[PDB]
C-alpha cells in the first residue's frame, strides 16, 4: 500500500526473522535510520486487532507495527480482550551478539478467562538483551482466514 | 541471489498466484518482456529436484523455473523418479479472461510405483486455456525441511 512506492510485480516485504530483528527492530532501538519507513508506530496493546490494519502503513494480508511494551510472559492484555501466547519465545540470532525473541499470540475478544478465540494472530518481536533498549517491540499482525 | 541486484532488506520475490500467472507465465507465453529476468529456463522434467537449485537464477529457500510441458494429470515423470500430484488443479484467475492453473506435486525418487517420497515440493503453474500457448509452464520448487 506504499511498499507500492517502488517495486516490480511479485516483489514485496517478506523479511526473515533475522532481517526483521537485524535491520528493523535493532535500528529503531539504536536510533538508526530504518532501511525504509514502512513500519507504523502505534500504541498497539490499546487496540482490538480488527482496528489495527487501519493504521498500518502498507499491506493487504499482513501488517507491521512498532509499539511500546515487552522486555517473556504468557499473554498480553489489549483493547477489549487479550492476546494469548501460542508457543514459546523463539530465539532469533542475527550475526552480532544481537539477540531477538519472537513469540506468537492469538487474540481473544472478551475479558479473561471468559474470552473467545478470534482468527487474529500476532508475532511479537522484542530485543531480548541484544546489542538496544526496552521499549519498542515489532509486531506482525494478520487474520488466519485472510 | 540476484533478486540481490536492487532491493532494501526484507524485500524479495514473494508473488501471489495472480501475479505469477498474470505478469510472468502470461508474458512468457505471449512473447512479452518479463518485468524482470529472474526465472531460469530449464528442461525441468529431465531433472532430479536436488539438482535443480543449481541452476535457478536466485533464491535460498525456494526456486523458480520456466520449463516445457503441460497443457491436467495426476503425476509427471522426471529424472530418476517421478512427481505425484498432491491436490487438484487450482484455478488462478487474474483480471482478464486470463486463466491459470496451479497444481502441487511431491517427488518420489525411484520408478513407479516403487518410488520413495522425498521432501521436494513443486507448484506447477500452467496456462489453462487463458488469453497464451502450450508450451511453457512456470514452476516453484522447494524442500519441506528447508
Swiss-Prot record, chains A, B:
One of its GO terms (cellular component) is nucleus. The keyword Transcription regulation applies. The keyword Transcription applies. Expressed in roots and stamens. GO terms for molecular function: protein homodimerization activity; sequence-specific DNA binding. It is found in: Nucleus. Its main location: nucleus. Residues 7-144 form the NAC domain. It comes from the Eukaryota. Induction: Induced by drought stress, salt stress and cold stress. Induced by abscisic acid (ABA). Induced by methyl jasmonate. Keywords: Activator, DNA-binding, Nucleus, Stress response, Transcription, Transcription regulation. Residues 99-146 bind DNA. Transcription factor that possesses transactivation activity. Transcription activator involved in response to abiotic stresses. Plays a positive role during dehydration and salt stress. Binds specifically to the 5'-CATGTG-3' motif found in promoters of stress-responsive genes. Forms homodimer. Interacts with NAC071. The NAC domain includes a DNA binding domain and a dimerization domain. Plants overexpressing NAC002 exhibit improved tolerance to drought and salt stresses. This is NAC domain-containing protein 2. The lineage of its organism: Eukaryota, Viridiplantae, Streptophyta, Embryophyta, Tracheophyta. The gene is NAC002.
Amino acid at each position: 500500500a506504499e511498499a507500492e512506492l517502488n517495486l516490480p510485480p511479485g516483489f514485496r516485504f517478506h523479511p526473515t526473522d533475522d532481517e526483521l530483528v537485524e535491520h528493523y527492530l535493532c535500528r529503531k532501538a539504536a536510533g538508526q535510520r530504518l532501511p525504509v519507513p514502512i513500519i507504523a508506530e502505534v500504541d498497539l496493546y490499546k487496540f482490538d486487532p480488527w482496528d489495527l490494519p487501519e493504521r498500518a502503513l502498507f499491506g493487504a494480508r499482513e501488517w507491521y507495527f512498532f509499539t511500546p511494551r515487552d522486555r517473556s510472559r504468557p499473554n498480553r492484555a489489549a483493547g477489549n480482550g487479550y492476546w494469548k501466547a501460542t508457543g514459546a519465545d523463539k530465539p532469533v540470532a542475527p550475526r552480532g551478539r544481537t539477540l531477538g525473541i519472537k513469540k506468537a499470540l492469538v487474540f481473544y475478544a472478551g475479558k479473561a478467562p471468559r474470552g473467545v478465540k478470534t482468527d487474529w494472530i500476532m508475532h511479537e518481536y522484542r530485543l531480548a538483551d541484544a546489542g538496544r533498549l526496552d521499549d519498542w517491540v515489532l509486531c506482525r499482525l494478520y487474520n488466519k482466514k485472510n
